[PDB]
Amino acid sequence: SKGKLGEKISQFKIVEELKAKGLYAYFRPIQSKQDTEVKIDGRRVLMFGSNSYLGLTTDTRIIKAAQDALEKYGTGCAGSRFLNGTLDIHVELEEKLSAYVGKEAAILFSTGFQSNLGPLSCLMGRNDYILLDERDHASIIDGSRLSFSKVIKYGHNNMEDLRAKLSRLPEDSAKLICTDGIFSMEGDIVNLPELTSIANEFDAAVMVDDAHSLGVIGHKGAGTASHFGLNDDVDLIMGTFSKSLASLGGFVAGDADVIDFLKHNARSVMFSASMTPASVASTLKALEIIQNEPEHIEKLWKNTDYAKAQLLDHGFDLGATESPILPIFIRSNEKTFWVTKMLQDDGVFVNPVVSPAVPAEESLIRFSLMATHTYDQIDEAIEKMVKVFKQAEV
Amino acid sequence: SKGKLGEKISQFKIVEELKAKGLYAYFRPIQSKQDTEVKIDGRRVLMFGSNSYLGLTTDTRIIKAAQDALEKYGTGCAGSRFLNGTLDIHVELEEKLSAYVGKEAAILFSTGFQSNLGPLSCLMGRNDYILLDERDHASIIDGSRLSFSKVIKYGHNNMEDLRAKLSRLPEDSAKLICTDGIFSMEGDIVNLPELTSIANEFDAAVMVDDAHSLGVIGHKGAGTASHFGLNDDVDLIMGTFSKSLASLGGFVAGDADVIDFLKHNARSVMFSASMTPASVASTLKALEIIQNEPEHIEKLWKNTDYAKAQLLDHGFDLGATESPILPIFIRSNEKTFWVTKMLQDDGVFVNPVVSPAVPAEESLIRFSLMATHTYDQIDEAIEKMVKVFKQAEV
């Protein structure tokens, strides 16, 4: 029955209002492969809103590995890994990821999102504590709410606040600190040296979500612990396959005892069907290419350094990024929606960040680089962004 | 740091003990397509533990649709549907599913699990209520814990308990009842006529999780509301693509206003990458086949009726199934593990259900049918189950 349900959703008017104003630019229906240019409404659009940092979703070797796995294993495993849904190739990919991030063992999940839910829901319990950076990804927030522990946020990269909040807690309790490695929004890197120093002093477990780090920072792209040299101070390395690795799924890697506990207790791996064969093979083939072909990471960072320097030369107000995510401040929700839609209509795709996610005065567009971008495409996008920021009177 | 983390996992010994006894049969590494027979350790094994109810993961038309979508769209969309991860083919599949279950609109999620998290987390809030059948799937439990509402369980298919618990609640509050359609464990069907009658009296929203119903019950497999004729008393129809539809992903279908609210507010669709092109195409091609080829549902139910009658003729104690899930009571955890492993070693794959999921005296194996099973395979599996139940002294 719909009376009270209709009341619950009655005040949600922003989408209605964006559509009526001709500003709506969510769920844009793309007609072609994710690439540096995409087809929308039959027209070519420069893509600066992707997470495919290495441009690998179009690599013919990765496509063919996925098509070969469909031929051999079919379209799905139709069960959780726990029961009838494990393939030899899942176990292969766990062993290859464990080697890549320097840990004993890994367990796959069918999404990155579910890879956070698993460890955060089942390791800390009643009378234990989870400590979260306040800017942590939604899936970390949600995973911790699925635990039976007390969840405490600390100020963004605020080591004095992390230390003070840990200091208040009973000695006779377990603690886990979970942090993004590279943070989605502003593209900044966690203070992993100080956070791990604090963790060692309080015997707190450390988990790092490397969704935006893997393929980006660390030796051969192995992520944030690899970037800092702190493999032996991080208990759990989480990743996704949907960004650099050009697929779908994710993992958590760690000590074999912890991982065996995880793979038999995490509801998000016991009660969810396993990754499709095509995505296992695509991830395996992408992981080989990231390591064997250093040019992809090389070219991502040349494009990042070039675009950041061009944006700063043209006087754009950038956030404190340390990654291929270039946050460009606009500081008005209305102007952020307008700029986003004007850029779309001029053939440039960027992602808006608006209230209520951020305060109006911190609203921005995110301009993300891929290895496969050209300096020409970058120059065309920044040319158009200068024109639209002028038209919009930012 | 690992001291307290090591203590948290120190008491988890069942897997250690199963391995040391030679009983361990979780995460069995399959080497071939999910089918009526699978390859494990180079040897053929009859598969009676699948959720591929219509045997479609091996259908060459579905394989080829998935391989064609890889060719055209590549390996991944590398973003949430909300931003850069929507394709024309996602929207197509939403429109086709909306038509199939008789609703205005649908929103895809990248797993079935995440399809529950989305509506249960974001529709009922502070001062509202979610009412859950106590046997509801883990993902429903978890989705409701992600809401800010008060979650109340009611006795399994207990309409007097549902009615009494709703009667206690403030009038000036929103309520949502969420139920499995077909329940995973015992294969029983919700009392949807009485539950919807109660829901209408209290103006509670009704959501049905049709993971085990779609492709199984309802006209042309359209699910539990279709089975009862109660489309207009169910607000939200959730499904997965990982079972009958032979893929990965899921959906929620409902009224366009509700679905627009959902697709802009559910964290599990805003902050998780979209389904791969291959799984969109496989699901679209499977959905066509389920509707156009009635023989698949036909044959699933002939196999179910034949196997249930054979099992009852041989004196097995069955649960109160109304589906292709045949729960066979053993009522000892030790015997359940032994029977499971002995059947594996004799070339028969079934799924155990043990403490702490159920009480020892209710431990059972689940024997699930597929359309593609033969009466010969059924007879061979039941022959071997009679031999092992004798050896085990059940």
Swiss-Prot record, chains A, B:
Pathway annotation from the record: Lipid metabolism; sphingolipid metabolism
Pfam families linked: Aminotran_1_2
Membrane topology: Peripheral membrane protein
Stored InterPro entries: Aminotrans_II_pyridoxalP_BS, Aminotransferase_I/II_large, AON_synthase_class-II, PyrdxlP-dep_Trfase, PyrdxlP-dep_Trfase_major, PyrdxlP-dep_Trfase_small
Activity dependence on pH, as recorded: Optimum pH is 7.4 to 8.0.
GO molecular function: 8-amino-7-oxononanoate synthase activity; pyridoxal phosphate binding; serine C-palmitoyltransferase activity
Record: residues binding pyridoxal 5'-phosphate: 112-113, 212, 240, 242
Its EC number(s): 2.3.1.50
Swiss-Prot/TrEMBL catalytic activity: L-serine + hexadecanoyl-CoA + H(+) = 3-oxosphinganine + CO2 + CoA
Swiss-Prot/TrEMBL cofactor(s): pyridoxal 5'-phosphate
Keyword Cell membrane: yes
Positions where N6-(pyridoxal phosphate)lysine occurs in the chain: 243
Biological process according to GO: biosynthetic process; sphingolipid metabolic process
GO CC annotations on file: cytoplasm; plasma membrane
Keywords attached to this entry: Acyltransferase, Cell inner membrane, Cell membrane, Cytoplasm, Lipid metabolism, Membrane, Pyridoxal phosphate, Transferase
Main location: cytoplasm
Subcellular location: Cytoplasm; Cell inner membrane
Family, per entry: Belongs to the class-II pyridoxal-phosphate-dependent aminotransferase family.
Function: Catalyzes the condensation of L-serine with palmitoyl-CoA (hexadecanoyl-CoA) to produce 3-oxosphinganine. Exhibits a broad substrate specificity concerning the chain length and the degree of unsaturation of acyl-CoA.
Quaternary structure and partners: Homodimer.
Protein name per UniProt: Serine palmitoyltransferase
Species annotation: Sphingobacterium multivorum
Upper taxonomic lineage: Bacteria, Pseudomonadati, Bacteroidota, Sphingobacteriia, Sphingobacteriales
GN (gene name): spt
